Amino acid sequence: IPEGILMEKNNVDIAEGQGYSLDQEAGAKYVKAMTQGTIILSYKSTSENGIQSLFSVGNSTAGNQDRHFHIYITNSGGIGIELRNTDGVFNYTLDRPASVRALYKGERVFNTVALKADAANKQCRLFANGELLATLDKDAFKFISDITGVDNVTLGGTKRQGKIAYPFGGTIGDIKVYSNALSDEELIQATGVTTYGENIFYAGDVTESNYFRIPSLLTLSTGTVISAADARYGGTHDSKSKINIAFAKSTDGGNTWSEPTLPLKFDDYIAKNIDWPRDSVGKNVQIQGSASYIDPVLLEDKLTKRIFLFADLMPAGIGSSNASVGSGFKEVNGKKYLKLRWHKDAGRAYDYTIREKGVIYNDATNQPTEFRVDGEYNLYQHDTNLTCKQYDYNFSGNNLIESKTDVDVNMNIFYKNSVFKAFPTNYLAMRYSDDEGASWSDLDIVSSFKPEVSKFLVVGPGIGKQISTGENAGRLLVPLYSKSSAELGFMYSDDHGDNWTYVEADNLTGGATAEAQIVEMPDGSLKTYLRTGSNCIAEVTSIDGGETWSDRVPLQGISTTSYGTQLSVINYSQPIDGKPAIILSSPNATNGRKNGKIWIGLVNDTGNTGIDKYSVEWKYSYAVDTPQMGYSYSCLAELPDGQVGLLYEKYDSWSRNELHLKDILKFEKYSISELTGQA
Ligand SMILES: C=CC[C@]1(C(=O)O)C[C@H](O)[C@@H](NC(C)=O)[C@H]([C@H](O)[C@H](O)CO)O1
C-alpha cells in the first residue's frame, strides 16, 4: 500500500438507495486492505432516510452482513462510524449527535467530515465542520485489513447480503482516502471549510466553560446587541452543578462579539474546561456541592438606558428540584431580612439575619454579631475577610471526586463550607449596568417577596419587557414561574428597577414549568406566551399593566410537546403586511425538541374592548432546518438593520442521548423577506 492518497472522486450524485461503486478505481485494492488511514469527504444529503452511509468498505456476501466499515450520518444530524467483523471478533463504534446539518436558509448545504484511524496511537477520531467531535481508544487496534472477505468499496450505502443498506441520497462533493493518518490540525482545517451561523460563546474562550445553554439576546436602544447564557462547566446538567452566567456584546450589528465576561459567578468551585463523560453511566453524574447561577434574563430601561441581568441564584448543592420550601427571609421589625444559620447550630436553626449595611444580627438577642457581608455577600469577621478552600472536580472511573485544593477564595454565605449559611431555597438575583457591561452594580437579591409556601420561584429565561405606552408606560416586567399558590407569575417595577413587586398570574399549585415571554399590544396592554405541562403553548392577557391576567387560552396551530420547551416571542418595530407584528421561535415537533420554526403573528383589532380587543394571526412559519434536526431553547432580537437575530440551542436539550455536547449554541440572522417565504 503506497503512502498518501489511495483514491479520490469528485461531484458524485447518488440516487437514494442506489449507492455508487468505487470497485473499479485504481486504488480499490489498497483501500480494501487499509491497516489505518484517513477519510475526508464533502457531502450534501437530500434524503430523509434515518441512517445514511457516506462511505463504506466490507463484505457484501450472504451471512456476512456484520463484516464492514462505514462512516454515516443520521437525519437528525448525528455522525459516526462502525468497524465490524461480526460481534464475536470486533464491533467498534464512535459517534456524536447534532454534529452536521441538512438545510440552511431554505437550501441543502454541504458538510465536511473526516475519520482518522491512527494505528501508531491506537486511536480513532471523528471531525465535522471544523470541530473534533469524538475520540475512541482501543488497545487492540483494528481497521479494514482486519475485516474478513472484503469485496467492495461503496459510496452512499453499505452492502449487506447484496443489498444497499443505510441508503444515502444526495451528492458526494469530494472524497479523499489516505493510507496515512493526517494531523488533527489538518483535519480541523480541512473540515472547517463549511460552517453555518456563528458562535458567541464557545469551548475554549475565556469563560473556561466547555458547555453553554439558555440563550438571551437583546438589541439596545443605542444599537449595541447584548447576549448572555449559562456557562455550564460540569456538563449540560441543570443546577446542582457549577454554572456561571456569561455575557458578550456586539457593536457592529451582531457580526463580531466581544471577549465574554462572567457578570454572575461563584468561586467555591473552580471554573475549568472539562470533558464530561457521555457513556451510559457517567453522563448522569453531576456536581454535588457547588453553588450556581442559572437561566438569564436581559432587559433595558429605555428611559435611563440602564440594562439589567437577572438569574436564579442556587445555594451550594441546590437546584429547583431540591430547593427547600420557604422564602429564605425572616421578618423582624416589620422588615424582611435574609436569614442565616451558624454552622455549629442545629441543622434547621436559622437564628441570624443580614440587616442594614450587611451587618449580621443575632435574632434572639437582637444584637449585632461580629460578622458582616459586603455587596457580594462574602463574609467578614471584625473587618477581616473570611476565606475557605476552593474545590476541584475530576472523574475517577465513573465516580466524580470533589476535593479541596490549596486555593483560597472569599467565604460566601451560599457556599457549603461557610460559617454562616443561607436557607437552601432558590433566590432571584440581579445586577444593573449603565455602561453596556463594562461594569456591573453590587449583587441585588430581589426575592424578599418569595411566598413562604413556595418551593421555588424562578425566572422565565430570555428577555423582560418595558411598557412603552398607556397609563403604565415605563413599567419594567420580568416573567417568573413557581411551585406554590401560582405557577405563572411576574415581578414589576415602577421606579426604574429600584424596587420590585411580585404578581401571581394564576392559582395553579402544580409547579409545572411555565417559562414565559412578554409582548406589548398597540395600546399598551400585554400578552404573555408560555410553555405549559400540556400539549400546547398558552396565551394570557393583561389590560392593567400586568397586575391581573386572563385565564390561559391555547395558542391554536403551533404544535409542541407535553413536557414543552422554552419559547421566545418579541415585538417587531415596523409593520409587516401593514399590521403590528410579533415574532415567535420554538421547536415544532410533538415529541423530541426538534424542527425549530420562526413564526410571524399579525396583530388585528377585533373591534372589541378589554381582553378581547386584539387577536394575533400566525400567518407565516419558517423552518430553520429539516424536521429531525435538534432545536431547543432560543431568543430572538430585532437587529439594528431590519434583520431578526436568533441565538439558539441546535440540539435536543431534553434527550438523555444528547447531553454534554460542545458548541451547540448558534447565532443566525434572517430578513423579513426570508421569514415570510418571500425568498
Ligand atoms: C434539563 C433541562 C431543564 C430545563 C429544560 O430544558 O427543560 C432548562 C432550565 O435551565 C431549567 N431551569 C432550572 C431553574 O432548573 C428547567 C428545569 O430544570 C425543569 O426542567 C423545568 O422545565 O428546564
| Pocket flag, ligand 1, residue 179 (CB < 6 Å) | no
Q: Which of 391, 502, 622, 633 is catalytic?
A: 633
Grid cell digits, residue 505? 398570574
Nearest CA to ligand 1 atom 11: 238
Q: Which atom of ligand 1 is nearest to the CA of 239?
A: 15
- Examine the domain organization and report whether 462 and 397 are in the same domain: no
Q: Is position 531 annotated in a ligand binding site?
A: yes
Ligand 1 centre to CA of 55 (Å) is: 39
Report d(CA 590, CA 548) in Å as an integer: 31
- Examine the domain organization and report whether 483 and 503 are in the same domain: yes
Residue 94 phi/psi, 5° resolution? Answer: -155, 135
Whole-angstrom CA distances from 212 to 205, 497, 612 are 11, 28, 40
Angle at 253 between CA 252 and CA 256, to 5 degrees: 55
Q: Which atom of ligand 1 is nearest to the CA of 230?
A: 10
| Pocket flag, ligand 1, residue 294 (CB < 6 Å) | yes
Q: Please answer whether residues 541 and 548 qualify as being in contact, where contact means their C-beta atoms are separated by less than 8 angstroms.
A: no
Report d(CA 429, CA 432) in Å as an integer: 11
Question: Given the DSSP bridges, would you call strands 568-576 and 51-58 parallel, antiparallel or unpaired?
Answer: unpaired
CB count in 10 Å sphere of residue 10: 10
Grid cell digits, residue 633? 431553547
Q: Which residue has the cell 450472504?
A: 62
Q: Please answer whether residues 619 and 179 qualify as being in contact, where contact means their C-beta atoms are separated by less than 8 angstroms.
A: no
Nearest CA to ligand 1 atom 20: 513
SS3 annotation, 167-191: CCCEEEEEEEEECCCCCHHHHHHHH
Grid cell digits, residue 350? 436559622
Whole-angstrom CA distances from 277 to 148, 211, 234, 362, 394 are 33, 13, 10, 46, 11
Q: Which of 515, 625, 638, 668 is catalytic?
A: 515
Q: Is the dihedral of CA 285, 290, 291, 297 positive or negative?
A: negative
- Examine the domain organization and report whether 587 and 675 are in the same domain: yes
Length of the chain in terms of residues written: 679
Residue 23 phi/psi, 5° resolution? Answer: -60, -30
- Examine the domain organization and report whether 498 and 578 are in the same domain: yes
Query: Which residues touch 113 (CB under 8 Å, ≥6 apart)?
Result: 40, 41, 43, 54, 71, 73, 79, 100, 126, 127, 128, 129, 191
Helix (H) or strand (E) segment spanning residue 9: strand 5-14
| Pocket flag, ligand 1, residue 320 (CB < 6 Å) | yes
Cα-trace Rg, the chain: 28
Query: Which residues touch 103 (CB under 8 Å, ≥6 apart)?
Result: 109, 623, 625, 626, 629
Q: Please answer whether residues 47 and 170 qualify as being in contact, where contact means their C-beta atoms are separated by less than 8 angstroms.
A: yes
Q: Which atom of ligand 1 is nearest to the CA of 458?
A: 14
Helices (H), 275-403: none
Helix (H) or strand (E) segment spanning residue 30: helix 28-31
Q: Given 424, 439, 471, which residue is the final one in a domain?
A: 424
Whole-angstrom CA distances from 14 to 40, 41, 50, 165 are 18, 14, 16, 14
Tally of domains within the chain = 3
Grid cell digits, residue 499? 424596587
Whole-angstrom CA distances from 656 to 142, 284, 637 are 30, 9, 30
CB count in 10 Å sphere of residue 136: 16
Grid cell digits, residue 143? 481497521
Q: Please answer whether residues 136 and 278 qualify as being in contact, where contact means their C-beta atoms are separated by less than 8 angstroms.
A: no
Dihedral angle computed from the Cα positions of residues 477, 479, 482 and 486, in that order, rounded to the nearest 10 degrees:
70
Report d(CA 466, CA 85) in Å as an integer: 64
The closest of 43, 58, 144, 149 to 100, measured between CA atoms, is: 43
SS3 annotation, 548-579: CCCCCEECCCCCCCCCCCCCEEEEEEEEECCE
Amino acid letter, 452 = E
Q: Please answer whether residues 109 and 194 qualify as being in contact, where contact means their C-beta atoms are separated by less than 8 angstroms.
A: yes
CATH at residue 535:
2.120.10.10
Dihedral angle computed from the Cα positions of residues 188, 192, 195 and 199, in that order, rounded to the nearest 10 degrees:
50
- Examine the domain organization and report whether 146 and 270 are in the same domain: no
Report d(CA 282, CA 206) in Å as an integer: 26
CATH at residue 118:
2.60.120.200
What is the maximum span of the chain, computed from C-alpha positions, in angstroms?
92
Active site residue 196: no
Which residues span the domain enclosing 16? 1-196
Q: Which residue has the cell 481497521?
A: 143
CB count in 10 Å sphere of residue 370: 10
Q: Please answer whether residues 378 and 412 qualify as being in contact, where contact means their C-beta atoms are separated by less than 8 angstroms.
A: yes
| Pocket flag, ligand 1, residue 250 (CB < 6 Å) | no
- Examine the domain organization and report whether 36 and 88 are in the same domain: yes
Ligand 1 centre to CA of 214 (Å) is: 9
Q: Which atom of ligand 1 is nearest to the CA of 295?
A: 10
The closest of 74, 151, 128, 140 to 594, measured between CA atoms, is: 74
The closest of 555, 407, 425, 441 to 483, measured between CA atoms, is: 425
Chain centroid to CA 322: 22
This structure's resolution (Å) is: 1.8
Q: Which residue has the cell 400578552?
A: 527
Q: How many CA atoms lie within 13 A of 94 on its CB side?
A: 22
- Examine the domain organization and report whether 527 and 601 are in the same domain: yes
| Pocket flag, ligand 1, residue 214 (CB < 6 Å) | yes
Ligand 1 centre to CA of 542 (Å) is: 26
Active site residue 238: yes
Q: Please answer whether residues 572 and 519 qualify as being in contact, where contact means their C-beta atoms are separated by less than 8 angstroms.
A: no
Report d(CA 515, CA 533) in Å as an integer: 10
- Residue to mutate, 213, 214, 230, 238, ligand 1, most ligand atoms under 8 Å from C-beta: 238
- Examine the domain organization and report whether 271 and 341 are in the same domain: no
Q: Is position 372 annotated in a ligand binding site?
A: no
Question: Given the DSSP bridges, would you call strands 292-301 and 462-463 parallel, antiparallel or unpaired?
Answer: parallel
- Examine the domain organization and report whether 110 and 187 are in the same domain: yes
Report d(CA 221, CA 302) in Å as an integer: 7
Strand residues in 234-386 grouped as ranges (E): 243-250, 261-264, 292-301, 306-314, 329-332, 335-342, 352-354, 359-362, 367-373, 379-381, 384-385
Angle at 621 between CA 618 and CA 626, to 5 degrees: 155
Start-to-end CA distance of the chain, whole Å, equals: 51
- Examine the domain organization and report whether 284 and 386 are in the same domain: no
- Examine the domain organization and report whether 270 and 357 are in the same domain: no
Helix (H/G/I), strand (E/B), else coil: 321 = helix
- Examine the domain organization and report whether 279 and 351 are in the same domain: no
The closest of 563, 608, 614, 615 to 590, measured between CA atoms, is: 563
CATH at residue 408:
2.40.220.10
Helix (H/G/I), strand (E/B), else coil: 31 = helix
Q: Which of 238, 295, 520, 539 is catalytic?
A: 238
Report d(CA 84, CA 79) in Å as an integer: 17
Report d(CA 319, CA 340) in Å as an integer: 19
Nearest CA to ligand 1 atom 8: 238
Report d(CA 276, CA 278) in Å as an integer: 6
Q: Please answer whether residues 605 and 572 qualify as being in contact, where contact means their C-beta atoms are separated by less than 8 angstroms.
A: no
Residue 412: DSSP 8-state:
B
Q: Given 136, 161, 196, which residue is the final one in a domain?
A: 196
Active site residue 515: yes
Mark 306-322 as b/e (b = at least 16 C-beta within 10 Å).
Answer: bbbbbbbbbbbbbbbee
Ligand 1 centre to CA of 69 (Å) is: 39
The closest of 402, 216, 391, 241 to 309, measured between CA atoms, is: 216
CB count in 10 Å sphere of residue 578: 7
Q: Given 196, 216, 234, which residue is the final one in a domain?
A: 196
The strand order across the sheet containing 170-178 reads 5-14, 170-178, 37-45, 111-118, 123-128, 131-137
Report d(CA 12, CA 486) in Å as an integer: 59
Query: Which residues touch 343 (CB under 8 Å, ≥6 apart)?
Result: 418, 419, 420, 421
